[PDB]
Design an enzyme around this catalytic site. Structure first.
Site, PDB file in Angstrom:
ATOM      1  N   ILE A 109     -24.590  21.275  14.526  1.00 48.27           N
ATOM      2  CA  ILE A 109     -23.594  21.018  13.483  1.00 48.27           C
ATOM      3  C   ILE A 109     -23.871  19.655  12.907  1.00 48.27           C
ATOM      4  CG2 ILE A 109     -21.150  21.294  12.871  1.00 48.27           C
ATOM      5  CD1 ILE A 109     -20.545  21.450  15.855  1.00 48.27           C
ATOM      6  N   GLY A 150     -20.335  14.543  11.068  1.00 47.70           N
ATOM      7  CA  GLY A 150     -19.567  14.037   9.941  1.00 47.70           C
ATOM      8  C   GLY A 150     -19.984  12.638   9.514  1.00 47.70           C
ATOM      9  N   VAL A 151     -20.289  11.762  10.475  1.00 44.86           N
ATOM     10  CA  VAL A 151     -20.654  10.394  10.098  1.00 44.86           C
ATOM     11  C   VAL A 151     -21.934  10.371   9.271  1.00 44.86           C
ATOM     12  CG1 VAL A 151     -19.433   9.346  12.069  1.00 44.86           C
ATOM     13  CG2 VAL A 151     -21.896   9.958  12.250  1.00 44.86           C
ATOM     14  N   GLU A 197     -22.806   8.698   5.617  1.00 42.63           N
ATOM     15  CA  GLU A 197     -23.995   7.922   5.272  1.00 42.63           C
ATOM     16  C   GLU A 197     -24.685   8.492   4.035  1.00 42.63           C
ATOM     17  OE1 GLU A 197     -25.016   5.044   6.326  1.00 42.63           O
ATOM     18  OE2 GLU A 197     -27.110   4.963   5.636  1.00 42.63           O
ATOM     19  N   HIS A 214     -26.753  16.910  18.589  1.00 45.27           N
ATOM     20  CA  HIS A 214     -25.405  17.138  18.050  1.00 45.27           C
ATOM     21  C   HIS A 214     -25.355  18.568  17.481  1.00 45.27           C
ATOM     22  CE1 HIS A 214     -21.600  15.496  16.098  1.00 45.27           C
ATOM     23  NE2 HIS A 214     -21.791  16.618  15.430  1.00 45.27           N
TER      24      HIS A 214
END
Lengths: 132, 132, 132, 132, 132, 132
Positions: free
Chosen positions: A53, A56-57, A61, A47
């Site tokens: 980068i 976002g998920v 977490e 990713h």
């Protein structure tokens, strides 16, 4: 709270433990954790290949794991998240995770979470948790 | 759409590619993808040691990746997510990811996402994306 | 038998545990296990870079692990294998592992194994095991 | 043939490339390859936690990869294997893979494979391959 | 001393345990360990993509781990290292680690380390350790 | 210099790239790089299970990689290292790598390296490099 204590408090472990230290703790109220973002973390390879980068998920977490430390020092599962991904996060960033308790009951908790790099907010979220 | 084509369409790659196949595609409208949940995926070792459960945030990433395939066949970054984690997902489950386009404009898209095991809904989300 | 119980029964663990669930069990006779094939399993990156295909030898290991569960519910090491790799297996497939006991003695066991995707047979094998 | 050339000849790659060097080569006839067995290989963590032992199926894969080098210097998929696992292999062993061509036709090849540590045979196999 | 005993003696573990066997041991004096170099070790993918070469710093770690076994059979942390990297090490090499004790006191130890492939010296070092 | 440029400049890659950003650069003279230390880096699981501490040898590799960036902006292999490990480094630390060129000739370079957390020096080294 240093990493060795974080390891014990957070049930997650490598490669899914996204807290390095606790910076600030006000029991029943607020916590501030630190997660260093490193180019040598395994998720960056995927990713993205051309461009590392932080997903976002995984910031979500990290905010959830910071919340769990706050709960434990005052089995939690993320029950809901309402999140805005404002700015990207990169290798070399120090991610600051700030959690404020909105409401805690015997069965659930609702918190507001802010992730920052420097003092720019990169992610804002409302999260809820259910005991399990 | 089989995995070899999925690999090309989705910019993410191992260990952060969470689509195996596209099951159904209606351009500009809806997509249904499949992600097999396997105990041999690297994240399970850390979530959790005593108890392998699929992290809710990775179901969100899978829904986001399914959306990206729908967009490409009709650089997207997740801009917001409003998600309810209803039921847990385990090794051996087949996770069905259903995305319906709410609104697409030149700069953004808003979708509704449902993750299912069998025909029980395990996750429901509204997601938005910004071009980048 | 769900994954948490499978983890205990099968001595192998990540990244070499290739059973997700037990679907059918007839003690001293037959077992049917399920292994989900996921593009997010670590071996796919190396077999092959241009083309993810499940290695035949790991289907043999999955059949051997299914057999071990059958033995335990009725230290085993694979002693011999006579195997035909009929059809390829891909990310997104659900691999069904069917083991029938041919002969069990105090020191050894001989079984017939069939791996299926849907109800097409992809692998057939005779395996023997020695206690160790 | 050193590892850099092996990397090119063998389509498999990490974590599923199980040849380090070619020791002996007689085109259209025989090859002898070397695979060092190291405790720092990823499969040992899962086979087995209490006791690191090389999985027999990966010795079969190593024999198959040695065969492929022999074929290329004179897309092959393993089509069948008839294998006896005689002795266990451990971290610190040097695994010698000896392949003799039984019969090669335009569409298939049948070989006899012997794996050795020192000059003790640990695995013996007949393998067949189909072009694909 | 075989790998299963090495695992216990050396506090490091995968992916940072760089000893396979102990070949020779003279308590309070000298140890000779073996580390097989395998192309299937995880560090090779990153050092270097175009060209797998064993990192010199990991030969230093292997020499340090060999020393620790010598100390334990007669928490140590590397305190200093003065090292010459003479020749490169490749997949397929068997790395021989020879440690001679220079001086041991209650709080520290100074050793001389030589790494060899065959009987060519590839690395020479003086190392010191402090108890911690 | 951000990570995407670092990735290009440093030939090492995951899991052996130990620079996140370049903070300061004076061509032909000095460089200051940053490496975030994260508990989610793969080496921590093995060094050590009971206690995550950054391996001293990987601080040496980070200093060597910082040097290589300085050389490239003004195939280098570490030829020698004379290093003192003064203080331990932990998840959550930001490791500052300061390299000063001692002498550069056509064939070799000698540098002095200092690793810092805050402004406490944790590692000091003299390194030499040979062109290859």
């Amino acid at each position: 709270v240093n990493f060795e204590e974080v390891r014990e408090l957070v049930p997650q472990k490598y490669p899914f433990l996204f807290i390095d230290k606790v910076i600030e703790l006000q029991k029943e109220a607020r916590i501030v954790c630190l997660k260093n973002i490193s180019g040598n973390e395994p998720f960056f390879a995927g990713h993205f290949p051309d461009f590392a980068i932080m997903p976002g998920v995984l910031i979500v977490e990290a905010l959830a794991q910071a919340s769990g430390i706050l709960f434990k020092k005052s089995v939690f599962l993320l029950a809901s998240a309402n999140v805005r991904f404002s700015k990207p996060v990169f290798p070399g960033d120090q991610l600051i995770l700030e959690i404020d308790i909105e409401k805690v009951i015997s069965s659930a908790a609702i918190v507001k979470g802010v992730a920052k790099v420097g003092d720019k907010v990169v992610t804002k979220a409302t999260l809820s948790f259910g005991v399990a």
